[PDB]
Design a protein around this ligand. Structure first.
Ligand SMILES: *[C@@H]1O[C@H](CO)[C@@H](O)[C@H](O)[C@H]1NC(C)=O
Ligand SMILES: *[C@@H]1O[C@H](CO)[C@@H](O)[C@H](O)[C@H]1NC(C)=O
Lengths: 50, 49
């Protein structure tokens, strides 16, 4: 979990929102690496978001 | 237990090609948690009744 440097359109929008709302953002990256949805991994019927 | 009975009923409905059902109950102690359990089971199931 080394800290990288991320930027782009989304972070610019986040900075604008923080400036307009006094937000102290803490940027994080998805460990799973996917958008995530309801998937069955175990425990039979499990529509849990990932 | 009644939850096992509800799961068996859901499996029987699935096997019987019955993907649409209506839950009609009556006011009686203990049935509220059974209704909650069956609702959670049908929501989490991928069958999509
Ligand atoms: C959020 O909106 C409410 C009402 O629209 C406003 O009173 C409040 O100041 C807003 N928050 C910020 C941080 O401006
Ligand atoms: C932004 O809002 C915070 C409230 O969490 C407040 O303490 C701070 O003074 C505000 N900043 C400005 C520049 O008004």
């Amino acid at each position: 979990t080394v800290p990288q440097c991320c930027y782009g359109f989304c972070i610019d929008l986040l900075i604008k929102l923080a400036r307009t709302m006094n937000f102290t953002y803490e940027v994080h990256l998805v460990a799973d690496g996917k958008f995530g949805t309801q998937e069955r991994v175990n425990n039979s019927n499990k529509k849990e978001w990932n | 237990s009644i939850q096992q009975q509800a799961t068996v009923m859901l499996k029987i409905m699935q096997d019987y090609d019955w993907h649409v059902f209506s839950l009609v109950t009556t006011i009686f102690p203990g049935y509220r948690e059974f209704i909650s359990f069956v609702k959670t089971t049908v929501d989490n199931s991928f069958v999509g009744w």
